Amino acid sequence: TSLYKGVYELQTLELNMETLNMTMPLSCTKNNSHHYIMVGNETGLELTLTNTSIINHKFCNLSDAHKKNLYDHALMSIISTFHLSIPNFNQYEAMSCDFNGGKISVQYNLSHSYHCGTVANGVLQTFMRMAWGGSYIALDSGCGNWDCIMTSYQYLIIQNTTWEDHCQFSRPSPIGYLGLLSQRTRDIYIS
Amino acid sequence: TSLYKGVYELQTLELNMETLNMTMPLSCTKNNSHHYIMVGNETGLELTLTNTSIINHKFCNLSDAHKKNLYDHALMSIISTFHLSIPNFNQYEAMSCDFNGGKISVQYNLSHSYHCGTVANGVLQTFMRMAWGGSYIALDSGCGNWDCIMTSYQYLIIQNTTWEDHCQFSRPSPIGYLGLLSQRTRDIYIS
Amino acid sequence: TSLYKGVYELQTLELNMETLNMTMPLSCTKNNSHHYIMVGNETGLELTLTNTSIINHKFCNLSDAHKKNLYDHALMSIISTFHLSIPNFNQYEAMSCDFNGGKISVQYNLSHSYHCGTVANGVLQTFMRMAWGGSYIALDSGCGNWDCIMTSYQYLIIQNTTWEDHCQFSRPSPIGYLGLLSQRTRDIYIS
Amino acid sequence: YELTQPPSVSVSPGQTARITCSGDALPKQYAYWYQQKPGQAPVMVIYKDSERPSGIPERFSGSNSGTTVTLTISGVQAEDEADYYCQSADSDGTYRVFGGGTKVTVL
Amino acid sequence: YELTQPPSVSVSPGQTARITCSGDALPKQYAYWYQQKPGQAPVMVIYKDSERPSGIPERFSGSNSGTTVTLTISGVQAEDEADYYCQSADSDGTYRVFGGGTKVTVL
Amino acid sequence: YELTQPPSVSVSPGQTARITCSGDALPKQYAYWYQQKPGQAPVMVIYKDSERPSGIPERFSGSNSGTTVTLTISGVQAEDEADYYCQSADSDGTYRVFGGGTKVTVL
Amino acid sequence: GLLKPSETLSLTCAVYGGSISSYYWSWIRQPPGKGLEWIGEISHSGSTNYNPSLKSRVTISVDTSKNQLSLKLRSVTAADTAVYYCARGRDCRSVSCYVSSPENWFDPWGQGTPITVSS
Amino acid sequence: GLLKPSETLSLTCAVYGGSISSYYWSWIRQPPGKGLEWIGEISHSGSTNYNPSLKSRVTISVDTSKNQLSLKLRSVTAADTAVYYCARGRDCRSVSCYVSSPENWFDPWGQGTPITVSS
Amino acid sequence: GLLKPSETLSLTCAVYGGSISSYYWSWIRQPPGKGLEWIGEISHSGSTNYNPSLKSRVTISVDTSKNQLSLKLRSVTAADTAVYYCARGRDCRSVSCYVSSPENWFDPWGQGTPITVSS
Amino acid sequence: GTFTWTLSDSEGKDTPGGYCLTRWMLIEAELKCFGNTAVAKCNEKHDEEFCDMLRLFDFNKQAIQRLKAPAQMSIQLINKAVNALINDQLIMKNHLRDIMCIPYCNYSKYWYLNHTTTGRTSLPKCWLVSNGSYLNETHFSDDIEQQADNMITEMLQKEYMERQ
Amino acid sequence: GTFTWTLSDSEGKDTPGGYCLTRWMLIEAELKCFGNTAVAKCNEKHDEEFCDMLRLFDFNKQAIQRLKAPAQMSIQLINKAVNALINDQLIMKNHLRDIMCIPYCNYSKYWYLNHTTTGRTSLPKCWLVSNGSYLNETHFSDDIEQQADNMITEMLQKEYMERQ
Amino acid sequence: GTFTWTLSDSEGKDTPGGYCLTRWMLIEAELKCFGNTAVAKCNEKHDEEFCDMLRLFDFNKQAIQRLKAPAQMSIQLINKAVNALINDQLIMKNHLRDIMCIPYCNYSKYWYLNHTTTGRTSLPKCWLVSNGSYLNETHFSDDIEQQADNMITEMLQKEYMERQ
Ligand SMILES: *[C@@H]1O[C@H](CO)[C@@H](O[C@@H]2O[C@H](CO)[C@@H](O[C@@H]3O[C@H](CO[C@H]4O[C@H](CO)[C@@H](O)[C@H](O)[C@@H]4O)[C@@H](O)[C@H](O[C@H]4O[C@H](CO)[C@@H](O)[C@H](O)[C@@H]4O[C@H]4O[C@H](CO)[C@@H](O)[C@H](O)[C@@H]4O)[C@@H]3O)[C@H](O)[C@H]2NC(C)=O)[C@H](O)[C@H]1NC(C)=O
Ligand SMILES: *[C@@H]1O[C@H](CO)[C@@H](O[C@@H]2O[C@H](CO)[C@@H](O[C@@H]3O[C@H](CO[C@H]4O[C@H](CO)[C@@H](O)[C@H](O)[C@@H]4O)[C@@H](O)[C@H](O[C@H]4O[C@H](CO)[C@@H](O)[C@H](O)[C@@H]4O)[C@@H]3O)[C@H](O)[C@H]2NC(C)=O)[C@H](O)[C@H]1NC(C)=O
Ligand SMILES: *[C@@H]1O[C@H](CO)[C@@H](O[C@@H]2O[C@H](CO)[C@@H](O)[C@H](O)[C@H]2NC(C)=O)[C@H](O)[C@H]1NC(C)=O
Ligand SMILES: *[C@@H]1O[C@H](CO)[C@@H](O[C@@H]2O[C@H](CO)[C@@H](O)[C@H](O)[C@H]2NC(C)=O)[C@H](O)[C@H]1NC(C)=O
Ligand SMILES: *[C@@H]1O[C@H](CO)[C@@H](O[C@@H]2O[C@H](CO)[C@@H](O)[C@H](O)[C@H]2NC(C)=O)[C@H](O)[C@H]1NC(C)=O
Ligand SMILES: *[C@@H]1O[C@H](CO)[C@@H](O[C@@H]2O[C@H](CO)[C@@H](O)[C@H](O)[C@H]2NC(C)=O)[C@H](O)[C@H]1NC(C)=O
Ligand SMILES: *[C@@H]1O[C@H](CO)[C@@H](O[C@@H]2O[C@H](CO)[C@@H](O)[C@H](O)[C@H]2NC(C)=O)[C@H](O)[C@H]1NC(C)=O
Ligand SMILES: *[C@@H]1O[C@H](CO)[C@@H](O[C@@H]2O[C@H](CO)[C@@H](O)[C@H](O)[C@H]2NC(C)=O)[C@H](O)[C@H]1NC(C)=O
């Protein structure tokens, strides 16, 4: 390569974080609208930024989902981490769910109040962190904006998917998820 | 000043924590009954120990406040930190609120059960921490009492105020607030 | 004893963690079915693995217990730590309580769904940690099983007891309890 | 916590008197020795286990061997007839204990 | 944030001219000095507080004493008649400030 | 994971025989070499990459060059005719692999 | 002087000196014919320690406006007849010993004040 | 050339050279008869700083496809008549100075381009 | 002796010696005419590792009351005809190698016991 | 988790590797530069109140210079960033000291030793508070003397390393 | 956040800078004094079970001597103070060891080396537990030997620093 | 709380006390061994992204070898174990750098210096990312040169300690 001081060669190393799949969720970015969280192999979550809703319920029947217990617990714990980590999430009308047969589908409405102190710039911070290391391409923002984060998309949809190698924009990494585990109880309002 | 070992002068330094106003809440003490938390400039909270109630509701309609969303989010997150940090707060009848038009007003009744395992010595520990570095003057207690903390006052009232320089007893410091951020989920009972 | 390098005697030290009783809960193991948490002297909790239920209610009236406030706060905070620390506890029908006159009695039904992603292997992990350093004898499992932990017993019953020296299988230690204080908000589902 | 001292010793003039003090906290705590003559306040004779305070004659020298401490009076003079006391703190400090006191007679 | 320089000095040929610059950020920030002759762009004369850039005559030497800096021109030549400027950054850096400029005449 | 050895070598008496072993885990793992004569259990000849166990003749000496290891038999005797095997663990350890075995004949 | 069994004893080492900053002052008593008994001590910061068997009846304090060290002993029920003494003790110029010190000693002694308790 | 009071000034130091990686390039102006005024600077990473009093009207950028450094000043309302100069500044080969540098200087200067603003 | 295809093979290195604390004992086999194949090993703590292709059919254990090392191989379906050997391996007197050791070796070998599997 | 924030470059001219506190951060409104022998220690120590404050002030400097001004003042940035900047267990330490009636640091005033010929200083220590006020020097002069000896030791170590 | 609690003064007469464990803290009911060369390490190490226990015991000593007795026994003080006293990730380390069937520390028994002529000792290490009992010395004598060499190294370093 | 996990034995033949990364952990599919002079530093540093990744990879190795395979893939083990393995405040540091438009580590690529005659290497540093790509060497060659001098210093210290 080149030598420093005439004797030290500069060398590089790249980590294969794919081998961490069996113990940790790995977050990938495919393109501006599709991001993925894979859990082990076979399954995982798909995070999509869209202009098409899938749920028009304005209900999120978690107590029913829990009573039936047909959902994959490893995906539900990713979703509760995502949700609980959203700062100042005081607009419950912005969140609809459809838990059916174990199917996981959660929809956040970013156009609800659409720019500081809004829904979109709360939900999108958690998104930026869970899909960190690639998700920035989906935000209509330059650097230097820690709060007023907005995208042009109206909905953030989280659904269960199957495993497929979708890591086209950026490589898998456990870091986004692991970082969020420390944010679970921060910025959560009373009642 | 004086020299140590004949060559080292002892010198002092005092920090101006006022310049930290734009990123962190700063807590001040004015006198025995009035304490303040300033957020940036223009606004903040006033913490008052009194014998005059302002709210006689016995209701705290947080879900309504959240639905309307007219309140300042930076003050609401200080209040939820204060509240969630109160150890063993199992007496909800001791807390009344009035959220109206974005107005923030929270009243804790310290005379409710009025001395270990009481309401007052729970609410007052959080108070002592958030207004730490000055608030001790308001407590009818000497040192050596970590739990049985009582004051002669009947109510602790938290209301939104405007910015004014009220730091007469003790200087502003972000330390009380920052310390409480680690206590948010401790000593909170089930349901 | 023996000398290392011809000059260093190997010596041992054993700690008396009983003297820590006045500030910290101490967890002991008596036998396969009975485990204890002592708080100070005079009182504490008894954790029993059994095949006999004591509660057949399918109700846990915590809000009523809190309103009456007749319970010992130091025991209630151990129970909420135990409960809140159970990962993925989405089966509330598995938990019954009877809080009466300050009496504390909590019963977890391990036979409810009876092996990963079940109730028993959630409740038993918290149990294994709170009664760590002795409780392993009660589990029908060898080493190498972090999740699929099962016992032959149907119920885990937590009740208030009196102080007695029951530390027959293993010595008192504050470590189980203190370790759980960091797990209070992990693996807790939404609503 | 108690310290043990003999109630008395006797020494012929010119001989060496030795008075001892023992207790369990002594490997951690320092002993101090005081001399009381009838009618006055005690005066410290040995500071820490062995050090002699200024003004105290060279005859007085202390030492220790772990759980015991001692005061040696070499070349005892008639001037040294007195009640000698040891003190030390308990294992955790805080509580200060005086020993019984050893009467030293010079015959 | 401002830097203060005298508006002018005068020196007889062969004498030493001294121009000074002062400000509060100077104990932390380095000063740089530039020379501008009529019709051209300024040329740096002193780099950091004292170092002379290559190509600059040995006549030019800088120094500092804390909140003040100075440029000394030893053996001033007619060639040195020029407007000399100091610059330094503010206390927090970021903002770069030029001083007023000292006209140095060679009489 | 496999180790590669030649299936055989031949050496005239008094010459030097060399048998090699290769694999990818070898820069991390040590090779051990064993000698098996017909009818008996193998005996270790080289311990770690080069060290000779007590009781093994000085003729046997090992070495390595990274991904390959080798056993050199200097001054081969008729006594050395045997099947020699290398072993090493996989990259992560745990799994122990023997190579194919090299038949060494003494002609 | 003479105290009755239900009276409070109040002694001040005004004569010797007291309340001198940097020192841990203490009180000691000697019942007639007996050895010495420690009563308690006060640090320059005002922090105190008392003989555990005596503690509930005893206060040691310093009046910093007067520079006077004093002892107050409640319920002086006969058994408290003794000669009472002050001692200066060790000094302290570090934070670690400000409110508590593992060790102390009694170097100068404040003469001794005989107290008689009777009826 | 000549600009009108509401026009944007656009200068490129194409003649001197510019957009050379590792250096912090800057713009300076000198109103006739006055001392020097710093306008702003750009790091090799593209990060910029501007004179706080001028900032709202000024853009400094580098066109990396062209290797050209340029200044755009809005609302050039007469007072902006000055000679404008580029300077190369300090270099940077470390992470710590990539987007911000406590210090800079103006070593080579880009000749100077007189700008007249009038009506 | 002779085993049938569905029988379990049970070998004990009682003759050589075994279950000696501090050592990692192992089993090796050599099908006639073939090279050596590792079967598995057991640490002094009782922890084991097996050849991944064989693992599902093999148990290695030590009887500490008997001081006997033994191998049990299930479903010995003809292909298992081989000479079986024990080897003592490396020792361990540290915590880090108690349940797992990156390396081992086979220094003394336990003679070899030919096993015939047929019908 | 341990703090990770690093201080920005703020060297003095004769204080390379150090960190200078500008006038708005100080009550005295003076510029004070501490060298690398004091500042470097902030990356090793977990128990220095001064170093944590040094990080909060540095954080503000970088956040204000690097981030675009918000609409309304928000505290989300600190709520997420705080553990990377300070040791929250020091707040707890001083809180427990206060409760247990032991002199404690309230984070506003510090002291240091400054050599009269070289200008070399110690890392500032917190001036402690007890019973509503500051402790007198006469209550901690032995700790000050220890700091003076620690500085002498370090100076000697430096010359010895020069001997190679 | 890193522990911040410091140990109280509990020096032995010949053990300055150290910390003595009184009889009620020990099963043996003996007084044991460890020097500063062992104790000082507790302020640097994040992974020593002994040092964390040393802090919990010291905490109790100070809390009982400094605070007024409560009405009923309350555990609020420890719930807030605990992270300042111990590394909770050691509990997690030993918990994971246990689950993964690796010898683990249950915090009750420790061992140390003690020089027979000088009385100098090592900082106690935890005696590990596996399959319901303590490991034998024969299962860790190589770690004990390493500790003996670490002590020899340190002794030599001391004399060398004496050579100046 | 500070990480407590220790790395398993993975020494190279000429790299005792170090740690070797096998091919499945590396994009290059090569075996890379780092010595104890680089690896030991992971137990002291709280701010090295490489060391935290080294622990996550080691964790996986031990968890897969030591634990019985689960029914369905569960993440409870990591949710409880993670703080013992990594410093979560480094994730926060890099997150804040990203937001504040400062080059940040995304944890995938590292660089180190390797001496051409001895094979001795530095502990890998993270190659930083800014504006969607990696920084060029020309943007950080001064930091590389500093690392080269730090290695030279350490080599000289070693020989000097040999002089005794
Ligand atoms: C850590 O622990 C220390 C020790 O406990 C604690 O220090 C104390 O902080 C307070 C708050 O800053 C200090 O109080 C100030 O004291 C001065 C002087 O008071 C004496 O002299 C005046 C003379 O008139 C007497 O009236 C008075 O009774 C005292 O004898 C006061 O002048 C200060 O008041 C002014 O400034 C305040 C700043 O907020 C204003 O709020 C107040 O209204 C006053 O403002 C007026 O005067 C200003 C003059 O500059 C002017 O600018 C304003 O516009 C306006 O006209 C104030 O009461 C106290 O002395 C410190 N004690 C010490 C060092 O022993 C720390 O606060 C504590 N915590 C922290 C985080 O540091
Ligand atoms: C909330 O917190 C913010 C910070 O977070 C506070 O805002 C700061 O307020 C101070 C006080 O006004 C600003 O301080 C600066 O002081 C400089 C002092 O100049 C010195 O040098 C001159 C030389 O002649 C002397 O005459 C003088 O006496 C001093 O010795 C000023 O020069 C600064 O002026 C500005 O303009 C000049 C010229 O364009 C620039 O060079 C400067 O860089 C600067 O832009 C200035 O006044 C400080 O800058 C403010 N900070 C920020 C980020 O804006 C709030 O006050 C506080 N709120 C409350 C309620 O307290
Ligand atoms: C998301 O999860 C659901 C629930 O597991 C998947 O749908 C089930 O697929 C199985 C396949 O054998 C069927 O038997 C169930 O009846 C289906 N349930 C429901 C509610 O549809 C669904 O396929 C998953 N999504 C994707 C993309 O794979
Ligand atoms: C506390 O907050 C309330 C809500 O913002 C403030 O009251 C408002 O003031 C604005 C001023 O333009 C009015 O237009 C609103 O109608 C008021 N709303 C209500 C509910 O009264 C109030 O003034 C703040 N308190 C203080 C002391 O400033
Ligand atoms: C568990 O707690 C309950 C509540 O304190 C104890 O029962 C009480 O005992 C007192 C004794 O004086 C009685 O006056 C109360 O009336 C009892 N209350 C109830 C609800 O029974 C109970 O004894 C405790 N359990 C044990 C084993 O001691
Ligand atoms: C601790 O603080 C209290 C309050 O400041 C001090 O008590 C005061 O002392 C002055 C004389 O100096 C009296 O005039 C006040 O009336 C006292 N106030 C109270 C509430 O008692 C106390 O002396 C201080 N303690 C120490 C050791 O200095
Ligand atoms: C930061 O990244 C942006 C996006 O990659 C760069 O802008 C692009 O530059 C190319 C020419 O090299 C143009 O063809 C594209 O159209 C530009 N895209 C956008 C969105 O503007 C930008 O130059 C980079 N900044 C630096 C300093 O290199
Ligand atoms: C691990 O512990 C178990 C239980 O103590 C040991 O198994 C026992 O061994 C004795 C003989 O020493 C038998 O009499 C018992 O019946 C066995 N009990 C069980 C449940 O199997 C086991 O040997 C220990 N492992 C090691 C390597 O020592």
Residue numbers in the entry:
A (entry chain C), B (entry chain B), C (entry chain A): 59 to 172, 179 to 255
D (entry chain l), E (entry chain J), F (entry chain L): 2 to 9, 11 to 29, 36 to 57, 65 to 72, 74 to 80, 83 to 110, 113 to 127
G (entry chain h), H (entry chain I), I (entry chain H): 11 to 30, 35 to 59, 63 to 72, 74 to 111, 111A, 111B, 111C, 111D, ...
J (entry chain b), K (entry chain a), L (entry chain c): 260 to 423
Text lifted from the article:
The LASV glycoprotein complex (GPC) mediates viral entry and is the sole target for neutralizing antibodies. In its mature, native form, GPC is a trimer of heterotrimers comprised of the receptor-engaging subunit GP1; the transmembrane-spanning subunit GP2, which contains the GPC’s fusion peptide at its N terminus; and the stable signal peptide (SSP), which remains non-covalently complexed near the membrane-proximal region of GP2 post-cleavage. The GPC is expressed as a single polypeptide precursor before being proteolytically processed by signal peptidase (SPase)21 followed by site-1 protease (S1P). We present the development and characterization of prefusion-stabilized, trimeric GPCs of LASV lineages II, V, and VII, revealing structural conservation despite sequence diversity.
In doing so, we isolated a mAb, S370.7, that binds with high affinity to the GPC and neutralizes LIV pseudovirus with an IC50 of 0.45 μg/mL. To further probe the molecular interactions between S370.7 and GPC, we determined a 3.2 Å structure of GPC-I53-50A bound to S370.7 Fab by single-particle cryo-EM. The model reveals that S370.7 engages two adjacent protomers of the GPC with interactions almost exclusively within GP2. The S370.7 HC and LC primarily contact separate protomers of the GPC. The HC, which features a 22 amino acid CDRH3 loop—longer than is typical for anti-LASV Abs19—has a 6.5% somatic hypermutation in its IGHV4-34∗02 gene and penetrates the pocket situated between the fusion peptide of one protomer and the HR1d, HR2, and T-loop domains of the neighboring protomer. The CDRL1 forms hydrogen bonds with residues K272 and S269 of the GP2 fusion peptide. Interactions between hydrophobic residues of the CDRH3 (Y112.5, V112.4, and V111.2) with residues just upstream of and extending to the HR2 helix of GP2 (L387, S389, L394, and F399) support Ab binding by forming a stable, hydrophobic pocket. We found that while S370.7 could still bind LIV GP monomer, it did so at a reduced rate with higher dissociation compared with its binding to the LIV GPC trimer, making the S370.7 mAb trimer preferring. We compared the epitopes of S370.7 and 37.2D, a member of the Arevirumab-3 mAb cocktail, and observed a substantial overlap, especially within the region upstream of the HR2 helix, implying that S370.7 is a member of the GPC-B competition group of anti-LASV mAbs. Binding by S370.7 causes migration of the fusion peptide to the interior of the trimer, where it resides beneath the C-terminal of GP2.
